[PDB]
Amino acid sequence: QLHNGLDFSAKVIQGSLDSLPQEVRKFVEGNAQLCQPEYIHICDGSEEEYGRLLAHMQEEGVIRKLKKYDNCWLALTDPRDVARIESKTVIITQEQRDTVPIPKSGQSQLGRWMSEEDFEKAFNARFPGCMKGRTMYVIPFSMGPLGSPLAKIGIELTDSPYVVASMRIMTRMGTSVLEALGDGEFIKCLHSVGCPLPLKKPLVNNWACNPELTLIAHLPDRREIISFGSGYGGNSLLGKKCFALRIASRLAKEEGWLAEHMLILGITNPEGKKKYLAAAFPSACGKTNLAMMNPTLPGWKVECVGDDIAWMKFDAQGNLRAINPENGFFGVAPGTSVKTNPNAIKTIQKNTIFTNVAETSDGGVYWEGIDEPLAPGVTITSWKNKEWRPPCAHPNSRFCTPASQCPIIDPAWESPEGVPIEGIIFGGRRPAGVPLVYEALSWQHGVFVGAAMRSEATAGKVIMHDPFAMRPFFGYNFGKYLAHWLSMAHRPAAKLPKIFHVNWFRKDKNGKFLWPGFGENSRVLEWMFGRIEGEDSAKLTPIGYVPKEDALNLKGLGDVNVEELFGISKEFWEKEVEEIDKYLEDQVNADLPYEIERELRALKQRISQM
Ligand SMILES: O=C(O)c1ncccc1S
Ligand SMILES: [Cl-]
Numbered sequence: 001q002l003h004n005g006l007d008f009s010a011k012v013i014q015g016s017l018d019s020l021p022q023e024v025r026k027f028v029e030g031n032a033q034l035c036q037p038e039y040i041h042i043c044d045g046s047e048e049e050y051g052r053l054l055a056h057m058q059e060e061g062v063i064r065k066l067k068k069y070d071n072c073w074l075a076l077t078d079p080r081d082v083a084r085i086e087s088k089t090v091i092i093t094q095e096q097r098d099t100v101p102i103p104k105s106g107q108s109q110l111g112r113w114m115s116e117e118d119f120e121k122a123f124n125a126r127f128p129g130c131m132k133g134r135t136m137y138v139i140p141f142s143m144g145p146l147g148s149p150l151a152k153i154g155i156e157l158t159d160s161p162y163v164v165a166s167m168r169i170m171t172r173m174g175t176s177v178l179e180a181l182g183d184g185e186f187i188k189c190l191h192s193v194g195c196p197l198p199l200k201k202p203l204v205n206n207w208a209c210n211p212e213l214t215l216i217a218h219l220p221d222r223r224e225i226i227s228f229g230s231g232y233g234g235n236s237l238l239g240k241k242c243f244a245l246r247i248a249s250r251l252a253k254e255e256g257w258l259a260e261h262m263l264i265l266g267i268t269n270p271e272g273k274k275k276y277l278a279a280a281f282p283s284a285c286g287k288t289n290l291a292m293m294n295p296t297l298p299g300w301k302v303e304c305v306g307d308d309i310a311w312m313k314f315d316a317q318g319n320l321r322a323i324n325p326e327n328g329f330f331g332v333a334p335g336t337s338v339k340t341n342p343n344a345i346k347t348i349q350k351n352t353i354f355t356n357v358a359e360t361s362d363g364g365v366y367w368e369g370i371d372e373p374l375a376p377g378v379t380i381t382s383w384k385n386k387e388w389r390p391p392c393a394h395p396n397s398r399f400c401t402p403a404s405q406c407p408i409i410d411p412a413w414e415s416p417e418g419v420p421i422e423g424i425i426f427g428g429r430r431p432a433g434v435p436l437v438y439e440a441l442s443w444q445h446g447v448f449v450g451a452a453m454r455s456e457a458t459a460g461k462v463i464m465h466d467p468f469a470m471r472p473f474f475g476y477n478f479g480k481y482l483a484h485w486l487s488m489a490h491r492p493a494a495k496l497p498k499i500f501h502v503n504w505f506r507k508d509k510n511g512k513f514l515w516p517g518f519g520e521n522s523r524v525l526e527w528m529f530g531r532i533e534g535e536d537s538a539k540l541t542p543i544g545y546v547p548k549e550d551a552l553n554l555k556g557l558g559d560v561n562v563e564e565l566f567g568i569s570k571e572f573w574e575k576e577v578e579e580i581d582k583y584l585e586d587q588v589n590a591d592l593p594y595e596i597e598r599e600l601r602a603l604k605q606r607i608s609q610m
């Protein structure tokens with residue numbers, strides 16, 4: 001070198017550039033050159049590092065300690081920066097069609113592509129000098145149990161201590177990961193809040209962000225994730241959606257596995273027999289509630305493996321093995337109660353970071369639907385830091401908690417070979433037409449059932465399509481994703497799990513729920529379990545198998561109207577098939593696989609014979 005080269009050794013405040021794997025050092029030093037951080041901190045993952053970082057954020061006004069609990073914290077954000085922004089989330093590939101199908105008549109709802117050239121301009125308009133005056137933290141992290149053959153490693157560079165703390169909870173991170181990685185391949189994750197010092201614009205609520213320039217980008221062919229201007233959740237904790245669904249789904253396709261928006265639970269019947277099930281419901285639905293269910297049926301146990309993302313690969317015996325690539329739960333707070341989710345309420349009482357919830361005057365947390373009366377003189381500060389009376393919490397407010405703290409965490413939740421999935425459940429909120437539960441007729445049918453998923457949006461009401469619960473998350477062309485799932489039927493040895501669809505939301509003509517739900521949903525899981533064992537507990541219908549009369553355990557429920565709850569109307573299903581047809585034709589178009597068109601035609605045909 002003729003001067004100091006591009007050596008940032010002088011600016012390292014923890015760790016050593018010399019001890020990094022060569023390619024990790026290149027990634028760090030290149031981005032230090034580009035972003036111009038004041039310091040580089042190579043994270044170790046230690047409790048001391050974590051404790052110190054939290055104390056520091058506290059000193060800078062960035063988080064508040066919640067004094068009601070053991071080591072819990074609260075962040076309140078700039079209200080411009082509160083959620084994933086789909087319209088600023090993009091995937092870059094040489095060809096648009098590889099990322100999203102070319103729709104027939106409308107705009108695609110299945111992803112957003114950006115050209116390499118357009119992304120380069122965007123990147124150049126954002127990242128140069130963006131970390132000036134700030135520490136660049138280097139977060140080495142594993143998605144999956146450390147050293148599992150199903151795990152994948154990333155390195156996230158960030159200028160946000162809040163991301164570092166949250167990534168500690170949500171991933172495995174620190175020195176052990178760098179040691180596991182060695183000279184292997186990793187996903188390159190670059191994040192900045194986009195507020196270099198000295199600040200050009202007002203800092204709101206001690207929450208650095210750059211809303212106008214917010215851009216969450218994915219470069220699967222480069223194995224890169226590049227995210228600018230949001231400090232929040234799925235935009236900044238790059239392991240979760242960006243890596244573990246978007247990038248990972250593309251890797252899965254290359255490699256023969258599946259990366260999916262599914263909870264994983266273990267269910268044990270009164271005789272001690274255990275199965276694992278995976279379930280995909282829209283983000284707005286109760287995946288966490290199901291994954292941590294407290295079953296009402298005596299002798300049944302539910303244990304949680306994960307509440308969000310599943311990586312699944314057929315092993316050499318044909319079993320579908322699943323891991324939770326996450327290390328925590330990043331759960332939507334509102335609606336979490338002792339009634340809807342007692343085990344979640346337990347988990348979050350220790351060592352948890354909350355974002356955009358309300359705070360009680362006794363240093364506790366609160367939100368819509370917490371269903372917990374407040375003591376005599378206890379008042380509320382809203383998530384906007386103002387006094388509040390009976391929203392107090394933002395609808396996308398969150399808890400971020402260690403998975404190991406769940407009182408019903410599955411004993412195998414970190415087993416490196418994964419847990420054997422025997423059923424895959426799809427579901428959506430449908431106030432009419434759709435039965436409580438049905439079973440797919442075949443693998444191909446089951447893939448169609450995934451494809452056809454629809455759900456009532458939270459509020460007049462709209463019923464939206466959300467195939468496989470993956471609509472915001474596909475890493476590549478959804479047609480090709482469907483072909484990938486279909487291909488599993490031709491894999492030698494593969495034991496294809498049974499596929500089900502559920503709906504907890506069916507209403508009578510007065511708008512009253514026909515099914516009580518919550519822990520009563522264990523009655524549906526019981527039926528599934530028996531069907532997997534080969535029990536003759538099903539009746540054939542045009543849409544699939546439903547429970548026979550008297551097959552569902554209704555003991556304890558009184559008079560459940562199973563007649564209406566399992567009613568199938570020709571008129572409803574005629575309309576439903578037409579809406580699914582028009583949707584797949586438009587959105588998937590030339591990339592719709594033959595077998596999915598065949599399943600659509602077959603369902604139309606069975607409905608025609610009613
Ligand atoms: O809330 C519902 O009723 C529901 N049921 C099944 C699957 C997803 C949801 S959101
Ligand atoms: Cl989010």
Ligand SMILES: [Mn+2]
Pocket residue numbers: 261283308
């Ligand atoms: Mn999710």
Ligand SMILES: [Mn+2]
Pocket residue numbers: 486489490595
């Ligand atoms: Mn086939």
Ligand code: NA
Pocket residue numbers: 061062063075076077078205206207
């Ligand atoms: Na704040």
